[PDB]
């Protein structure tokens with residue numbers, strides 16, 4: 001009934017993929033208990049840093065990537081959820097289920113990637129475990145793994161970036177192309193699609 005209807009919690013930043021040095025590694029900034037509390041209140045006063053965030057709901061964990069001052073992730077992870085912030089839940093400024101794409105204003109302290117203008121097809125995918133996977137672009141929204149890997153390896157990395165050799169954002173990791181459980185290619189939201197959504 002109406003009085004007892006529940007409210008879905010906010011997406012919560014629980015860590016980041018550190019790319020600021022010569023070694024890529026995942027950092028956790030909030031544990032599961034604090035994540036559950038923060039999802040319900042929508043108040044998150046933890047310091048945010050970097051370009052790639054690890055995010056979580058009550059039931060899923062995945063990635064989010066800052067590009068052009070917008071923290072982007074996948075609709076199949078975030079739905080229409082708000083994101084927790086120091087002053088309370090923040091509503092999505094972009095939602096496109098047809099692209100599996102959502103976005104919030106980038107948190108204070110985060111750094112944003114620059115959209116790629118290189119026109120280059122030698123890409124790199126960053127996973128939630130801080131693995132940097134070489135990927136050859138095969139189309140507007142597809143890229144092949146130079147070394148295929150079980151889909152278990154990529155699970156939880158949707159919302160992560162595909163980057164060019166110069167570190168520009170080329171797309172947002174959306175889905176794995178799987179055959180007999182082996183990921184030979186990835187599907188991603190092109191950064192141009194994000195730019196069109198922004199307009």
Ligand SMILES: COc1ccc2nc(C)c(O[C@@H]3C[C@H]4C(=O)N[C@]5(C(=O)NS(=O)(=O)C6(C)CC6)C[C@H]5/C=C\CCCCC[C@H](NC(=O)OC5(C)CCCC5)C(=O)N4C3)nc2c1
Nearest residue numbers: 060062076077097100151154155156157158174175176187
């Ligand atoms: C509900 O509204 C919407 C709207 C749009 C939409 N568009 C979609 C494309 C869409 O796909 C669904 C979600 C996505 C997915 O699992 N992605 C992640 C991921 O990590 N997720 S995640 O972080 O674990 C999580 C689950 C958020 C917490 C990256 C991959 C890692 C491992 C793969 C595991 C096996 C799934 C393989 C699927 N392969 C696949 O469909 O390949 C096609 C056929 C499509 C294109 C290439 C060929 C796949 O990858 N899938 C299915 N769902 C939606 C849902």
Ligand SMILES: [Zn+2]
Nearest residue numbers: 116118164168
């Ligand atoms: Zn580039």
